[PDB]
Each structure stands twice: as structure tokens, then as C-alpha cells.
Design an enzyme around this catalytic site. Structure first.
Site: not given
Length: 228
Positions: A89, A183-184
Site C-alpha cells: 500500500d 493514512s499515508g
């Protein structure tokens, strides 16, 4: 971020906000003058509009001399990432031009040595993600220190039953956690980027379900190839 506190203004110059049509979408980390690292599933939705990267910010809404909004030349998701999985991811975003560097905007060194962080080590995660279960979004950058979990413990039946591969790492999530909108973003241990907050719907702040981060050392070859 749940259970954290406002970060010292501009004390994390590598912090990036990945935006879709002017709205914060995911966190990101500046790893080179013209490159930002984030999570692939963030783009899955980012596809519906114009993606930009905000650098040098503390507040998402107030003007700051260091703030700069950059357009994106190209988005490079990891070739093995799939919509129905949390593996691979990662996403690399190439800015339309090299970022003007300064005290408030600086890339962060990332981990190349493929070795697990010692259990108990405290790592720092920062983001503009939701701050409570009601879904409240902060205007300014928040952060929280979280201790890393040993590889074996995260895979417990009562936790992430085998869901954790060698390319994933976990951190304790007892009342403090990264959550939606974080997220990220970065997981920094000892001043070096060790992980990236994995995308995917999951409960936050529940100690039985630890937070999951993608280990960047496992992808050193892919990153090197994209930046070359």
C-alpha cells in the site's frame, strides 16, 4: 490522531497533506525534493478530482509564510497493490517542481536496512486525521508517540490473525492511535522514517486491534527505481 496532542508548529518539516479538490485527504512524507510518499488506497478515491500536496503547513486553513500548495506531475502506485488488500500500500507522488526547501520544508531520511524496530521503542506518528470517534477533524497538525509491538504479538488470533507479513509492522493502540485521515503519513523512529500508516477501514484506539504500518525498508528497491 486519537489520544494525541497538537504538534509543535513546523517541527516536522517533512509532513505533507495530500489533498483532493482543496480538501485534506491523506497524510504524506517528503522523501526527496520532488517526491512525496503516501498510501495507494488514498489515490483509489483521489481519482475523482485534482490532487495537490500542501507542504510547510501547521494549520490547514490559516495563511502561513511557509505554506505552499504544489500540483502533481504524476502518481505512481506500487505495481502489486490491489483494491481489496492492504499489501504493498505505497504511492509515490511527483510534484510539478522541486520543493523550495527551508526550516519548515525538508525531506526526511528513510530506513533502508531491513531490520525490525525493537519492541517497546516509541515512534512518532503525526496527521490531520480525526481526533475522536465522532469524526472531528482538527485544523492543526496533531501527533502521538506509540510503542512498537513485537512481530509475533500482532498476529495473535485475538488480534490480526496472520494478517501481518514481514513487510508490515504494528504499534500499540490503547486509547492512542492513528485513525481516518492519518493514512499515508509517517511513523518515525529515532529520527528516521520507518513506516507509513496503512490505508483500510479499521477501528481506532482499540487495544485488541493494533495499528498497522507498511515498512519502507522492504520497498527500498521500488523507491530507488521510481526516483532514479
Amino acid at each position: 490522531i486519537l489520544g494525541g496532542r497538537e504538534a509543535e508548529a513546523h517541527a516536522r518539516p517533512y509532513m505533507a497533506s495530500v489533498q483532493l479538490n482543496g480538501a485534506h485527504l491523506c497524510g504524506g512524507v517528503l522523501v526527496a525534493e520532488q517526491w512525496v510518499l503516501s498510501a495507494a488506497h488514498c489515490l483509489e478515491d483521489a481519482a475523482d478530482g485534482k490532487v495537490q500536496v500542501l507542504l510547510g503547513a501547521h494549520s490547514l486553513s490559516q495563511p502561513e509564510p511557509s505554506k505552499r500548495l504544489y500540483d502533481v506531475l504524476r502518481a505512481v502506485p506500487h505495481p502489486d497493490s490491489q483494491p481489496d488488500t492492504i499489501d504493498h500500500d505505497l504511492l509515490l507522488l511527483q510534484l510539478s517542481e522541486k520543493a523550495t526547501l527551508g526550516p519548515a520544508v525538508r525531506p526526511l531520511p528513510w530506513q533502508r536496512v531491513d531490520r525490525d524496530v525493537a519492541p517497546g521503542t516509541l515512534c512518532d506518528v503525526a496527521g490531520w486525521g480525526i481526533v475522536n470517534h465522532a469524526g472531528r477533524r482538527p485544523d492543526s497538525l496533531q501527533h502521538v508517540l506509540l510503542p512498537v509491538l513485537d512481530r509475533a504479538t500482532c498476529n495473535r488470533r485475538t488480534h490480526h490473525d496472520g494478517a501481518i507479513t514481514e513487510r508490515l509492522m504494528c504499534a500499540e493502540s490503547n486509547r492512542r492511535d492513528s485513525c481516518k485521515g492519518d493514512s499515508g503519513g509517517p511513523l518515525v523512529c529515532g529520527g528516521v522514517l520507518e513506516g507509513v500508516v496503512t490505508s483500510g477501514s479499521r477501528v481506532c484506539g482499540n487495544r485488541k486491534k493494533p495499528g498497522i504500518y507498511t515498512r519502507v525498508a522492504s520497498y527500498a528497491a521500488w523507491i530507488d527505481s521510481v526516483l532514479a
